[PDB]
């Protein structure tokens, strides 16, 4: 392909670096070492994340600008769409977005007005929309990771006993409550691994050593982008280690976030909500913004969980260089509608945006030429891929979400 029009783009973005959600015993227990504290309340966009945020927003002003889907100056308001989660989070990385993609031009964010209740097009198994069967999650969650969930200890033991060594669990208190048991301090181990699906089918959380380590491995990386002083006592460190240390973390996503039986049920009103202003389709089932005919970004400020249901839903797959999370702060899945001007035939490319480790921590400033954030073309399970932007035809696309969603699911 050669001569397409960028017409129209997605993004599913990240919200940026954040306090640590929730510090529980169990956190507490497992190390002898205290965990350094934010300068945030928990779970609220830090400044230098919202700062972090406006620098990518930067790079994706020049990039579509570049391109031509962007003016030069300031967008108008049809131009960009940009909605956000209820969380703090999320509104705050929205307009730090706009912030830095569109710079003093005063855009505005939108999002759910009720601040009080999850909105359902990022969370609608938790807004009650549709519900999860406990039975046959267990089933399929297993068939996904292809064994019992207590392979988990063989399969990553390099990086359980990395993480191990890292916190120094052998000196911990949940070790010495462990030995005064006559058991071993073996922290790929130190409990079962365990799905639970709440009574109403709401919610399904993962709990365990797996679980245990996605968290902590996310919050060393979030100290790290935080350009905190200690990240993981200093016993963290060599891009191999970081490596490691956050393929937990990336599995953790895989099995609970990227497993289709999940997935779609999570993910239906994200993926129709994508697909149906990609192409601005603007009363099709799903499309649930006041999406002018004039839209040319749309930006959703959700999580990295979001960003793994879409994933799984579409078979997609990726490794980020000098990236170690696979849904890093602030990172984008982008949503590329081209079309070919001899024909209208359009076609879907997906490419995931991100900062890098050293482009977090040092907030450097990106660029298209010198210093431009890392962009990866991701290949769709049953689409064409043809060419660098790895294309899939619209039919074809199509054909796959219908396929993929959970129509119950919808809003």
């Known amino acids: 392909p050669t001569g397409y029009t960028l017409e129209r783009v997605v993004i599913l973005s990240r919200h940026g670096v954040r306090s640590p959600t929730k510090q529980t015993?169990?956190?507490?227990?497992?190390?002898?070492?205290?965990?350094?504290?934010?300068?945030?309340?928990?779970?609220?966009?830090?400044?230098?994340?919202c700062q972090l945020v406006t620098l990518m927003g930067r790079f994706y002003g020049d990039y579509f600008r570049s391109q031509g889907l962007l003016a030069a100056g300031c967008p108008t308001d049809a131009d960009i769409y940009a909605q956000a989660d209820v969380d703090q989070r999320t509104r705050l990385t929205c307009q730090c977005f706009l912030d830095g993609i569109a710079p003093g031009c005063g855009l505005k964010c939108h999002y759910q007005a009720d601040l009080k209740?999850?909105?359902?097009?990022?969370?609608?198994?938790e807004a009650g929309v549709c519900k999860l069967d406990s039975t046959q999650t267990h089933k399929c969650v297993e068939e996904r990771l292809g064994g019992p969930l207590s392979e988990l200890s063989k399969r990553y033991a390099k990086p359980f006993a990395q993480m191990g060594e890292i916190l120094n669990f052998a000196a911990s208190p949940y070790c010495k409550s462990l030995q005064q048991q006559g058991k071993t301090c073996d922290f790929a181990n130190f409990a079962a691994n365990k799905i639970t699906v709440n009574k109403p089918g709401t919610k399904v959380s993962l709990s365990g050593p797996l679980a245990l380590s996605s968290t902590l491995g996310e919050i060393?990386?979030?100290?790290?982008?935080?350009?905190?002083?200690?990240?993981?006592?200093?016993?963290?460190?060599?891009?191999?280690?970081?490596?490691?240390?956050?393929?937990?973390?990336?599995?953790?996503?895989?099995?609970?976030?990227?497993?289709?039986?999940?997935?779609?049920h999570?993910?239906?009103?994200?993926?129709?909500?994508?697909?149906?202003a990609l192409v601005?389709?603007?009363?099709?089932?799903?499309?649930?913004?006041?999406?002018?005919?004039?839209?040319?970004?749309?930006?959703?400020?959700?999580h990295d969980t979001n960003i793994a249901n879409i994933a799984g839903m579409l078979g997609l797959n990726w490794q980020l260089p000098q990236q170690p999370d696979n849904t890093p702060p602030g990172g984008g899945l982008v949503f590329?509608?081209?079309?070919?001007?001899?024909?209208?035939?359009?076609?879907?490319?997906?490419?995931?945006?991100?900062?890098?480790?050293?482009?977090?921590?040092?907030?450097?400033?990106?660029?298209?030429?010198?210093?431009?954030?890392?962009?990866?073309?991701?290949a769709i399970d049953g689409c064409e891929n043809i060419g660098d932007d790895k294309?899939?035809?619209?039919?074809?696309?199509?054909?796959?979400?219908?396929?993929?969603?959970?129509?119950?699911?919808?809003?």
């Open 25 to 49: 015993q169990l956190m507490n227990d497992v190390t002898p070492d205290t965990w350094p504290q934010w300068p945030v309340a928990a779970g609220e966009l830090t400044p230098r994340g």
């Open 117 to 125: 209740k999850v909105d359902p097009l990022f969370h609608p198994v």
């Open 220 to 264: 060393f990386l979030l100290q790290n982008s935080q350009a905190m002083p200690d990240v993981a006592w200093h016993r963290l460190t060599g891009e191999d280690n970081w490596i490691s240390l956050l393929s937990l973390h990336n599995a953790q996503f895989d099995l609970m976030a990227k497993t289709p039986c999940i997935a779609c």
């Open 266 to 276: 999570k993910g239906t009103p994200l993926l129709q909500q994508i697909l149906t």
């Open 280 to 302: 601005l389709q603007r009363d099709a089932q799903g499309q649930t913004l006041p999406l002018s005919p004039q839209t040319k970004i749309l930006f959703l400020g959700g």
């Open 336 to 378: 590329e509608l081209w079309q070919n001007p001899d024909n209208h035939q359009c076609y879907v490319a997906v490419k995931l945006f991100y900062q890098t480790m050293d482009q977090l921590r040092n907030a450097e400033k990106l660029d298209l030429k010198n210093n431009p954030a890392g962009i990866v073309p991701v």
């Open 391 to 411: 294309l899939c035809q619209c039919d074809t696309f199509q054909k796959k979400v219908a396929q993929a969603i959970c129509p119950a699911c919808h809003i």
